[PDB]
Amino acid sequence: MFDKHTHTLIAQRLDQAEKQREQIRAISLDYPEITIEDAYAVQREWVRLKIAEGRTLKGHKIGLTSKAMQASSQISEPDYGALLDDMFFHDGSDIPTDRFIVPRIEVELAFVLAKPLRGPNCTLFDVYNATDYVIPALELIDARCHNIPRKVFDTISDNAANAGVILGGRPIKPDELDLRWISALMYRNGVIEETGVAAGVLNHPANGVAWLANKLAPYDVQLEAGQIILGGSFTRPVPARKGDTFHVDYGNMGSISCRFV
Amino acid sequence: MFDKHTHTLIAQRLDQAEKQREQIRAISLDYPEITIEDAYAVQREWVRLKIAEGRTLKGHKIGLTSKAMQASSQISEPDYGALLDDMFFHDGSDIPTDRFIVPRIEVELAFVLAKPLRGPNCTLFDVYNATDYVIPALELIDARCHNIRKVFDTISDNAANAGVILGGRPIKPDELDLRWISALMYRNGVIEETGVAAGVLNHPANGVAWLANKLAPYDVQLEAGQIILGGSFTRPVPARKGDTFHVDYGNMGSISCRFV
Amino acid sequence: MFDKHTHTLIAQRLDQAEKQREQIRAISLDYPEITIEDAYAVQREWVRLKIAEGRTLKGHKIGLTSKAMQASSQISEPDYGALLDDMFFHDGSDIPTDRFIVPRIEVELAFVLAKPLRGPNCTLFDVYNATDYVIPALELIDARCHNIRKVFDTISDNAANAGVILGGRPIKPDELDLRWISALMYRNGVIEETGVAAGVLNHPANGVAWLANKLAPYDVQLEAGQIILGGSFTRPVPARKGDTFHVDYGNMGSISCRFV
Amino acid sequence: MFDKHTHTLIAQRLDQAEKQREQIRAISLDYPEITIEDAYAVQREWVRLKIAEGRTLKGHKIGLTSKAMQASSQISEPDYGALLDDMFFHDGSDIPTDRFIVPRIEVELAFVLAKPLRGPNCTLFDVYNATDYVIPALELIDARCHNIPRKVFDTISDNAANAGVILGGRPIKPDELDLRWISALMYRNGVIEETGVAAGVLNHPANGVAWLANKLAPYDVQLEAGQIILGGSFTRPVPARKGDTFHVDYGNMGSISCRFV
């Protein structure tokens, strides 16, 4: 573990990278001995910094769910990041492309909590009990560190690649239908680029939420009522470029659209 | 276009590559001016040779459907290959890994034809009229050429064909919306890929009509009784000795196999 | 009834059998006058020891449900065992085969309690009232005693408990008729067993009420938050290194794992 | 392969065993070199003998489907036998226990053909096209050879253990519902003894029918229109004893009952 001073410095550089839309060198290259604990400490510092600037915590996301599952990727479990108020964009809105560096769109489900979730021993059943609504959600992810390589410690430090969130479609009670079989078609500029099924997220798209509550418990942190929790992408991320229209069709769960300007 | 004898020569090399389970150099490297027409001519020659050896044509597949669709891929349209009787394995079979080189599993839908389909101007509606049943189908794809322009290699190599595994629930085309058939591909207990049938050319029947139209100028049609695989809704997943696969198509049933 | 010290001694032997993955002689052979009361006393001692070592009680299981029902089996009623935290594996996990002796997979339904259940006179309706969710659950059972009267060995051996794997679709008890939940157990791509939930004591919730009633005289109840496995709808299937399991509960989802 | 004379002799002994309700020695013990081809030839001879006596061919069954599938059984594929008119008992009827030796009840689905099925290259799709109705069916199986051992060649010779058939419940068109998920509870004397799901029969309960048509093709034999084809048991066989009542509940597919007297 590094000194807190080091964590703060790395966070400051990530912050400047985001604000200037200019990537820094991969943190893992400058800090070869960085640990997963250091990476989450950098994240916590950056989130603290951004909230001090006037932002508000609105929830969390669980990421790297596919890579955590797939056998031929070295990664052993998912990651997590914090969602801030300024990350949220309305369904059907213009997204300012110049605000981002290498943005990509992911297809997810969001859990809107009615009740807090606190670890350890948080279970899928606790998630069901605490969830007010499930709603489709797109994530816009980005990278403040250069890719050419980059590692998981860099992504985690970099607030798990968080940049944007777009909620939309049909809100449902958790018991309304089997969440495992929610499916989606991601269109970009009139063409299907990816498809996926929600079970591709950790066997059940709610599993990440309980896992997250358990990860946050040691820090005396819980998932608060009113928070929005993004469970993971059931598609590979798709690059977003200026002029692109996205339309993600979740069938009977509705759709989410946006345009990059 | 190369002369017929060159097409026969390349086909013979691919044939021995398959039989010996030993990859040859990419055809496009050895023949730098190979065309798409040459590639299909090589494929035709190889299929002819394999049928002469005692195999029987059972259908066709449409491949490279995702790449054809994807904006950032150079591939402009799908490819096709011939399905032969010895490519078919039963649901829940042990699959001999040693017979293959670098096998990968794809998740598809098969169209079992009751009537012939002939181009040009074959349409989605023609496909529906001619289809007896739709059934889940896995493809096992392979490569007889070394991996490390390259579309010509794949096409010559009978569009990567190697195996087919049918299984699950047979349905009439009109039973449900084929576009929203969804699948989870498990390997060794873990979901490796997921996908939805609309990912195959917007409608999984579209490739069938497209194929009939591609074959028409050669005085070839899709025959009654043929099985047509329309494209994969997932990226292919490597198959290795010891692997079990289970592909869950929800209410459309499942297909499983084990590599031994 | 044996003295407490004898119960402790037998429990210690079972504990070392589990830790060393080395079977001991059947307890009923070494103690020919062992009773059912002794067997549960041994189980209680072993659970106490394992909890003292740092494990936590997470629930219970009801076993031997089919034998209890079958007319041609001597077993008159089900058995029960304690489920501990280190027995639980996630859906889609690699399971370490070396940790077990002769592991077998069973197909069950779990009841996740929102409220306590206490006997005597606990009923099906009490179970429904106290259950938060029902979810598919696999059990991995094992034997710390050599196989080649014998019910006493199983009961002492914590009712063959070893592993638990939850997965699939969580439902409220009232969502559908639990009696007709059905499953296909695949191992290595092939269906080895099938069964229907009503095969568990006529209704898969019945064992939960039965268990509460068995535990009451010991001043023990089923606690809120506990996971109760009610019995297997299939015969157990051996698990060996390299095996993949996939248990398809239809619209109730699936549970999978691989033994490594 | 034995001489036809040998096949006829074995068939005659099986016939006497059935008529006298007295088991013979396992054929494989008396004929150590017997092949699967010999076993089906013995079967064909016995069926010919029984039809010459005045019986009529009503269909076929596919058996040993579970053992053919399970990894820890040596058997590689299913078996088949011929169903004769006198094997059929009405739903809800008394079954004369004295007519049988060691009878056991199996739980199956029957396919009633509207059109003939001829191999080779008969497919599941041909079965669907030729099937008029699917209906629940119980099989009563028996053994004319002693068990203490007996092998597959003995069972096949012994007309694949055929003895009885009981049709009942709800007839459906093949396309009415997914046949794979038809499920059943077998009660004997008020107690559930076995349960099972139809997919346990070769992954699809119709698969055996196409397989059978393909097996019969070399003999210039086809499955005829009007024939009843039993696809295989999705339960282990359960002994039937004098005084036993059976009730097999196929849920929304109805039930079949009988009593042994």
Ligand code: NA
């Ligand atoms: Na991984």
Ligand code: NA
């Ligand atoms: Na393209």
Ligand code: NA
């Ligand atoms: Na009993």
Ligand code: NA
């Ligand atoms: Na077998």
